[PDB]
Amino acid sequence: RRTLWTTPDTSPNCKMSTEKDSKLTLTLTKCGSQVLGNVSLLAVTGEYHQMTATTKKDVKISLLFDENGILLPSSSLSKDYWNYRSDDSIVSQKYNNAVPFMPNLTAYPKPSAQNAKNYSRTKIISNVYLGALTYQPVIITIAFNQETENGCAYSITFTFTWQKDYSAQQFDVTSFTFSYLTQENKDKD
Amino acid sequence: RRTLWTTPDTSPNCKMSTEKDSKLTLTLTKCGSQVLGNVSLLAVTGEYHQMTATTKKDVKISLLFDENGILLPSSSLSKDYWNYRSDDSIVSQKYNNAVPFMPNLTAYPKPSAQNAKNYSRTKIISNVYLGALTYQPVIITIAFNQETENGCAYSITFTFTWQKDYSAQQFDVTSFTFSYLTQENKDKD
Amino acid sequence: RRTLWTTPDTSPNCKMSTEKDSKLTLTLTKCGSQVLGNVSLLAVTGEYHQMTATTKKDVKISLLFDENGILLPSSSLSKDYWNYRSDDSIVSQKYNNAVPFMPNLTAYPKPSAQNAKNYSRTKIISNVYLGALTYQPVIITIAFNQETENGCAYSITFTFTWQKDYSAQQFDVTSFTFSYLTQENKDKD
Ligand SMILES: CC(=O)N[C@H]1[C@H]([C@H](O)[C@H](O)CO)O[C@@](O)(C(=O)O)C[C@@H]1O
Ligand SMILES: CC(=O)N[C@H]1[C@H]([C@H](O)[C@H](O)CO)O[C@@](O)(C(=O)O)C[C@@H]1O
Ligand SMILES: CC(=O)N[C@H]1[C@H]([C@H](O)[C@H](O)CO)O[C@@](O)(C(=O)O)C[C@@H]1O
């Protein structure tokens, strides 16, 4: 139907530093030509659960998709935790076409040998806040179709960068709203 | 139908400092799994209409809802000014179920004795601008389901905090767009 | 149907400094009472393609609309590049009513002789980032119905202001998501 999500439930589903150390909460709702997205990230275990002065202040969460809009297994997000919504959970059928949720390849073209620097419109940059504390910005960069690894047709990545020393804190950020233009393709299984 | 709002019209509808001293403009539009929200606030009378150096730089607007998604009378927003949209105004029938507009309780759980600190995803933090002047930030914090007062089932609060001295100015801020995941429940009267 | 856009394709369509020196990418998707908007801007030729220390750090892109929601020819955006979406392009019929996409005149009234200063809710102010570089903010101000020139019924303007010296760089900014309340009127040709 019209929502792809992680659910807001079940277990750790995502890699920040190590396997399944974090919960990505992501909802993509189809609104015609655009998706309305909503994202947040929490470290449950590992380095980012209790940062140190040496913790790298840059974390990239990569969602890579095939030609059918289906999440690839090399993604940061586990596939077992991502699908069309059903009653606060996900549908039982595993491999559902999702091209209408994919970022538009004309608006957001893959990076090329021809175009040295890609269009800045392929990114959204803003701040979210660590611990929901207003003095603790974390820069969020959302990029569309800028990955080429593992034969991906589409990509959505969420990069969190920061400057301030958040040592001894758990990585946990406020929610961020965004939108992007979708691929026109539609078909199903 | 698919919009709950204050309307952009009628009188002062909200308490910042004193009763009906302000106009909250709020529109919630249902887009499947998410609501697309749009908010702004204006002080019409009282302290916040002409701030002083001693004016507290923190204003919380609380919308508290019952089990049916209906605004509770202890809210900052008057109930007479809040309902489903009809032709630039509101519907005549007063008590309309609105669970499909309520923030999801799994994504945004009420704060618990078990979980000392709640998930940061329960909040959105950004800036709006006082007087629409780019050198006058006001931090907006939107929180979902973080109130427990007056037996509320759900809550949406808008907190405006700031640092700079806005003495002699009227509190009036730019509009802010946001979204949140909705409760799955749907039923009606 | 439910999207008005520039397309993400074809040629320069917009004036920053001189005629057709830039590509405005703008998509407006109708979501009931609100439009979900998405905007970015790129300078292709002229001053803003290679800025200097004397380049004015203020660029206003004006979309002016008639009573039917149709773009006026005095707008910054060329009319040949703006219409309802069709399969990654635009519809062939040129003059299509678009009142349901226009900003609400009660929420966002035209400026008046009576009201010395207009409601700040008529604007959205945030930052986008030049070159998608996180140290290069550009303030975006979106204003609804604040133009009166050329007999316009409605307006949407995008102003980009900045402080930092971006000499030798191409003006190109990250994408920005926003929403606004729509006029209730609906009719067609
Ligand atoms: C919401 C917001 O903009 N917060 C910002 C705060 C505020 O402006 C406050 O006045 C004081 O923290 O200032 C910062 O320098 C900070 O604290 O790190 C950047 C941060 O992004
Ligand atoms: C839209 C925006 O980000 N405005 C910010 C401005 C600008 O960056 C300008 O360069 C100069 O006001 O700087 C501030 O310090 C300020 O004025 O209070 C914080 C404010 O949030
Ligand atoms: C996304 C964001 O907020 N970027 C801001 C950065 C960061 O806060 C970084 O820590 C260091 O650039 O700081 C600024 O002073 C800058 O660089 O111009 C303002 C800019 O808006």
Residue numbers in the entry:
A (entry chain A), B (entry chain A), C (entry chain A): 186 to 374
What does the paper behind this entry write?
We crystallized HAdV-D26K in complex with sialic acid to clarify the mechanism of interaction. Refinement of structures generated from HAdV-D26K crystals soaked in sialic acid shows electron density for a small-molecule ligand in the apical depression; this is best described by a racemic mixture of α and β anomers, in conjunction with double conformations of sialic acid. We observed three copies of sialic acid bound within the apex of the fiber knob trimer, as previously observed in HAdV-D37 and HAdV-D19p. The high resolution of the datasets generated to determine the sialic acid–bound HAdV-D26K structure enables visualization of multiple residue conformations with partial occupancy. We observe split density for Gln348 in both pH 8.0 and pH 4.0. While conformation A can form polar contacts with sialic acid, conformation B points into the solvent and cannot. We also observe greater occupancy of conformation A in the pH 8.0 structure (approximately 0.7), while at pH 4.0, the occupancy is evenly split. At pH 4.0, Gln348 has approximately half occupancy in each conformation. This implies the possibility of HAdV-D26K having lower sialic acid affinity under more acidic conditions, such as those encountered during endosomal trafficking down the lysosomal pathway.
Adenoviruses are clinically important, both as human pathogens and as platforms for therapeutic applications. Species D adenovirus type 26 (HAdV-D26) is both a cause of EKC and other diseases and a promising vaccine vector. Here, we demonstrate that HAdV-D26 uses sialic acid–bearing glycans as a primary entry receptor and that this interaction can form a productive infection. We solve the structure of HAdV-D26K in complex with sialic acid [N-acetylneuraminic acid (Neu5Ac)], revealing a similar topology to the known sialic acid–interacting HAdV-D37 fiber knob in the sialic acid–binding pocket, but highlight crucial mechanistic differences likely to enhance HAdV-D26 affinity for sialic acid compared to other types.
